[PDB]
Amino acid sequence: GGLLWKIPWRMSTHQKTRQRERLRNVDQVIKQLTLGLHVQRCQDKGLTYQEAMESKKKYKPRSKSLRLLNKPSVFPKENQMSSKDKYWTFDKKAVGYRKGIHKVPKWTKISIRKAPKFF
Amino acid sequence: FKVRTSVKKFCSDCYLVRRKGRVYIYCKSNKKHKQRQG
Amino acid sequence: STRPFLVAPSIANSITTEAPAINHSPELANARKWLPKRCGLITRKKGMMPYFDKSTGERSAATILEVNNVEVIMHRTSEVNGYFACQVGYGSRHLSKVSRQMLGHFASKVVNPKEHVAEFRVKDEKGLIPPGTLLKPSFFKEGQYVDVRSVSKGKGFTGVMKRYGFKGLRASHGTSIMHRHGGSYGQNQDPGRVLPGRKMPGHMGNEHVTIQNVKVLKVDDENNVIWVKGSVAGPKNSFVKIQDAIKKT
Amino acid sequence: SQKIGHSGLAFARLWHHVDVARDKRTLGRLASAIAITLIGRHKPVYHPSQDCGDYVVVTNCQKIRVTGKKFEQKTYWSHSGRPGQLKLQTMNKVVADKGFGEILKKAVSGMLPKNKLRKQRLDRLKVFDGSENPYKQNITAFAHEQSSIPEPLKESIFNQLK
Amino acid sequence: SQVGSLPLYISPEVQVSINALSMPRIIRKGRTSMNISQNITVKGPKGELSVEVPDFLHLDKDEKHGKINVTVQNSEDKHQRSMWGTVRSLINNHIIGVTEGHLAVLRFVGTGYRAQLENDGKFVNVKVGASIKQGLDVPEGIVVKTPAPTSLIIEGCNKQQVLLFAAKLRKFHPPEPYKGKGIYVNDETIKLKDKKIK
RNA sequence: AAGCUAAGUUGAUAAUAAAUAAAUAUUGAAUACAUAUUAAAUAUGAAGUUGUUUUAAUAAGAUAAUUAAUCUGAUAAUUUU
RNA sequence: AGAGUAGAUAUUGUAAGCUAUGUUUGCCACCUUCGACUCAACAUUUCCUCUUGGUUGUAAAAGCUAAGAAGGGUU
RNA sequence: AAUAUUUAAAAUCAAAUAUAUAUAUAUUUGUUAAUAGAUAAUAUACGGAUCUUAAUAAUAAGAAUUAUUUA
RNA sequence: AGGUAAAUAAUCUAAAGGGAAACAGCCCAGAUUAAGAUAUAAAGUUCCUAAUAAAUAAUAAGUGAAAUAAAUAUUAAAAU
Ligand SMILES: [Mg+2]
Ligand SMILES: [Mg+2]
Ligand SMILES: [Mg+2]
Ligand SMILES: [Mg+2]
Ligand SMILES: [Mg+2]
Ligand SMILES: [Mg+2]
Ligand SMILES: [Mg+2]
Ligand SMILES: [Mg+2]
Ligand SMILES: [Mg+2]
Ligand SMILES: [Mg+2]
Ligand SMILES: [Mg+2]
Ligand SMILES: [Mg+2]
Ligand SMILES: [Mg+2]
Ligand SMILES: [Mg+2]
Ligand SMILES: [Mg+2]
Ligand SMILES: [Mg+2]
Ligand SMILES: [Mg+2]
Ligand SMILES: [Mg+2]
Ligand SMILES: [Mg+2]
Ligand SMILES: [Mg+2]
């Protein structure tokens, strides 16, 4: 009411592009972690780096966090996500049950990917 | 002229009109049904 | 004959078109204006006298306006000056008082050194009177309507009560020293300033005044006077511009 | 080293012509280009503390392009300082009162920087509704362009000056 | 499209020609626009008349059977085919004007309500009731005749002009529902209200 | 008596014109019909707008003279218009 | 929903619904003169004056209701 | 071409992922706009300019709005 | 309610610098001193003002363009 926190209700094209890149970067981090674990498993079994990378059979991670992060239904990749959920986040105190993801504190660091099926 | 945000057609002889960036209703039979979307 | 010059292709090949007329131009302004079809006179207010109608006995005040050597000096035109006007000179003056430049001007226009010079704007070219012609009081018709322009009397640094008719304050009931003052001159912090045009004490008078629809009662040439019903702005021996009325005929 | 030499050509105020009859850019875009020229950003010798601008002459402004209903709707404001004296004039009326080039002049003035150089850069822009201007000879021309121009047109541009 | 697709039958005494002008005028709108550079002229026994038409509309002749058709390039454009229909209607109306003519009958209902012609038949004076004289002067291409003071005939070759003049005359006194009083443009009538004085 | 003044005297309320608001119309489709148009064309319409009239300030422009015992101003003296 | 001799919509619109103002009475605690006289400037949510639509409920006159309208006026 | 709920990716349909090499299970995504309602008091306030494009037609403009995206 | 009472972060308090027009608390980032070549964060690239070229649809209302105003009404879009 009194203070002027002039935060617009919708993002711009540049903001959307940056958000897309950030999502992609997190996806890349997850992918690299899994690949490193796979190569480590191969090297422990005896193979070397070259055919560890070229191995037809890729070893899946055995930790809960990595397995869940790799499941698309838990942490969908950027290209899998919907345009709505790329930029809008779920709020139960807002008309339409949505708010711009840029109104979340520290939104460039924290990650949101999934909202309720019917919201 | 019934200037109102809700404009209907009461007499079957009412006809809609799009003039001056506004919606009008004119009735050929009953002149009471003239309306304007203000 | 031949000199070195170069032409830009853009300018050379530009298509010729005429710029439209803009309202803020002398031609359109002159067309719009409301001007008489005849020139007027310069006169010198001499004073006021009664006027008695011989037939009905009506008595009405009348100002006496002297016509003394009123001559047309030169003309103004639309193709040279942007408006149609007749410059008119009144009176006789002395070499010592007139300047060399204006002496040359009067000599060139073949007139004598003049007490006063002022120009009257006519509607078109039909109203321009030839230069050097002496204009007489009979230039106006008895019973017609003219407009008179002149500088009014000076009243000096006048207070708000006299200048704008403010009521002032009471003379009693505890009123303090400021009796003849205008009261408040603004509002609180919101404006924070006195708005332009606030009525305040200041010099009044010595200002041009145009009185319209003054009736010409009597005109005679053996005395060189013009009679105007009513009153004319300015003190005695003050110059007045008389010209046919624009509103009534 | 690059700076040592004859800078007289560099700091020369050329005269540029933009014929709105041929130009296809709209009012604002044309005005942005004109403002760039008047500021002098197009000169590699430009430094902010200096006024390196060039003269610009605009002709046939009566064919300027305006999109939408701006002509009948856009309003220009002016206020002396006395409350209740807010003049609001439509673009149509401003055009009928002061001409078409007045709109372009306002646009360029708005796009110019807000400095002591603003007005002297603005007066450097000459606008004419028609084609008749006194700066026909004050336009950059080269000897290698004269071939296309016919002789009578050259004679007209030379002898029939204002 | 149904209106504009109907052909036109032209008698031997009426001819229709189409040509272009020197100054194409281009009028603007939002995402659309129009360009007008053609003109159609209809000649007939009762004078000549003309219409302005865009470049996207063409007339197909047929001397046999005396038939002419009007068509545009692209009917997918609603803002084009509406103009096609309107231009068909206008040229047909002009053809009726030249071959036969357009007529309107004004009836002056009311006691003392009457019309007269003055100024060599140029001015029309109406007495619908006023302390001030009322009327107006006929435009070019329209001619007026009064068989009776209470009746008036306005006719010419341009339907729009004849009927606009008729309506302008009627504006002085339209019909009054309580008692029939005013100028009636044509056979059209009004419904009167009951007396039912309080 | 002069002057000032209103209780007195005189004049004015600034047109004609141009676009419009609400609103009243002609022809006319897309949409056989209908529709004044939030299509193309064609008209009416306000003490409001533009203007006009009146008074400030500006001087684009115009006439004239240009080193003068009567070229232009000022200081100075007698004063009010 | 109901009055309006008839008919919810000429006028009228009673519980409830959606909003607008920040002139009222309160609420918070960032920040510790009412009236009169004089002169008023601004807004329009127009009282009068101009243009206009509706009104078995506008025959005329006087009205009611509404649209444009802040130029002038408003003990 | 006419009677014509609803404003939808749940269900169906179409593209993609992970297991599957003659085919299936599971997962991810894709379902409307414009105007009116609109709203006060020193001064119009997207920060301002200004922003919608058009053949003939020149070196050379055609969102600077919204929604998905690319380099 | 820029209210009040406590519960998790974070910042101001005690934090300069970039963005949010201006801005204690929001987005990014923590000034030992310089230099100014490279990669940048948030935010942006018509001019004021450092920096951009495109694709596919929609808008015609200057709607909107860095503070989305509701019920409702009108006109338009396809599924059988
Ligand atoms: Mg007193
Ligand atoms: Mg005391
Ligand atoms: Mg005292
Ligand atoms: Mg005080
Ligand atoms: Mg029809
Ligand atoms: Mg009708
Ligand atoms: Mg008027
Ligand atoms: Mg009832
Ligand atoms: Mg209630
Ligand atoms: Mg109002
Ligand atoms: Mg009555
Ligand atoms: Mg699904
Ligand atoms: Mg405001
Ligand atoms: Mg608190
Ligand atoms: Mg800290
Ligand atoms: Mg402390
Ligand atoms: Mg800081
Ligand atoms: Mg910015
Ligand atoms: Mg800053
Ligand atoms: Mg806007």
UniProtKB/Swiss-Prot annotation, chain A:
Annotated organism of origin: Saccharomyces cerevisiae (strain ATCC 204508 / S288c)
Q: What else is known?
A: Present with 2100 molecules/cell in log phase SD medium.
Point out the gene that encodes the protein. MRPL31
Lineage of origin:
Eukaryota, Fungi, Dikarya, Ascomycota, Saccharomycotina
Tell me, in one coarse class, where this protein mainly resides.
mitochondrion
Q: Does the keyword Coiled coil apply?
A: no
- Which GO MF terms are attached to this record? structural constituent of ribosome
Annotated GO biological processes are:
mitochondrial translation
Q: What does this protein do?
A: Component of the mitochondrial ribosome (mitoribosome), a dedicated translation machinery responsible for the synthesis of mitochondrial genome-encoded proteins, including at least some of the essential transmembrane subunits of the mitochondrial respiratory chain. The mitoribosomes are attached to the mitochondrial inner membrane and translation products are cotranslationally integrated into the membrane.
What protein name is recorded for this chain? Large ribosomal subunit protein mL60
What PANTHER family does the database record attribute to this sequence?
54S RIBOSOMAL PROTEIN L31, MITOCHONDRIAL, LARGE RIBOSOMAL SUBUNIT PROTEIN ML60
Q: What keywords were assigned to this record?
A: Mitochondrion, Ribonucleoprotein, Ribosomal protein, Transit peptide
Curated annotation (Swiss-Prot), chain B:
Protein name (record): Large ribosomal subunit protein bL36m
One biological-process term from Gene Ontology? mitochondrial translation
Q: Domain of life, per the record?
A: Eukaryota
Other information: Present with 500 molecules/cell in log phase SD medium.
Q: Which family does it belong to?
A: Belongs to the bacterial ribosomal protein bL36 family.
**UniProt keyword terms in alphabetical order:** Mitochondrion, Ribonucleoprotein, Ribosomal protein, Transit peptide
Q: Which residues of the full protein are shown?
A: 56 to 93 of 93
Would you tell me the Gene Ontology cellular component terms?
A: mitochondrial inner membrane; mitochondrial large ribosomal subunit
Q: What does this protein do?
A: Component of the mitochondrial ribosome (mitoribosome), a dedicated translation machinery responsible for the synthesis of mitochondrial genome-encoded proteins, including at least some of the essential transmembrane subunits of the mitochondrial respiratory chain. The mitoribosomes are attached to the mitochondrial inner membrane and translation products are cotranslationally integrated into the membrane. bL36m may be involved in a process influencing telomere capping.
> Its principal location?
mitochondrion
Say yes or no: keyword Ribosomal protein present: yes
**Oligomeric form and interacting partners:** Component of the mitochondrial large ribosomal subunit (mt-LSU). Mature yeast 74S mitochondrial ribosomes consist of a small (37S) and a large (54S) subunit. The 37S small subunit contains a 15S ribosomal RNA (15S mt-rRNA) and 34 different proteins. The 54S large subunit contains a 21S rRNA (21S mt-rRNA) and 46 different proteins. bL36m has a zinc binding site.
Q: Which GO terms describe its molecular function?
A: structural constituent of ribosome; zinc ion binding
Transmembrane segment boundaries: none
Swiss-Prot record, chain C:
Q: What is this protein called?
A: Large ribosomal subunit protein uL3m
Q: What does this protein do?
A: Component of the mitochondrial ribosome (mitoribosome), a dedicated translation machinery responsible for the synthesis of mitochondrial genome-encoded proteins, including at least some of the essential transmembrane subunits of the mitochondrial respiratory chain. The mitoribosomes are attached to the mitochondrial inner membrane and translation products are cotranslationally integrated into the membrane.
Gene3D superfamilies xrefs:
Translation factors
Q: What organism is this sequence from?
A: Saccharomyces cerevisiae (strain ATCC 204508 / S288c)
Belongs to which family?
Belongs to the universal ribosomal protein uL3 family.
Task: State the HAMAP family in the record.
Answer: Ribosomal_uL3_B (MF_01325_B)
Q: Name one GO molecular function term.
A: structural constituent of ribosome
Tell me the subunit arrangement. Answer: Component of the mitochondrial large ribosomal subunit (mt-LSU). Mature yeast 74S mitochondrial ribosomes consist of a small (37S) and a large (54S) subunit. The 37S small subunit contains a 15S ribosomal RNA (15S mt-rRNA) and 34 different proteins. The 54S large subunit contains a 21S rRNA (21S mt-rRNA) and 46 different proteins.
Swiss-Prot record, chain D:
Where is it located?
Mitochondrion
Q: Name one GO biological process term.
A: negative regulation of translation
- What InterPro entries has UniProt attached to this entry? Ribosomal_uL13 (IPR005822), Ribosomal_uL13_bac-type (IPR005823), Ribosomal_uL13_CS (IPR023563), Ribosomal_uL13_sf (IPR036899)
Q: Name one Pfam family in it.
A: Ribosomal_L13
Q: Quote the record's miscellaneous comment.
A: Present with 6700 molecules/cell in log phase SD medium.
Instruction: Tell me which NCBIfam families the record gives.
Output: rplM_bact
Q: What is this protein called?
A: Large ribosomal subunit protein uL13m
- Source organism per entry reads Saccharomyces cerevisiae (strain ATCC 204508 / S288c) (Baker's yeast)
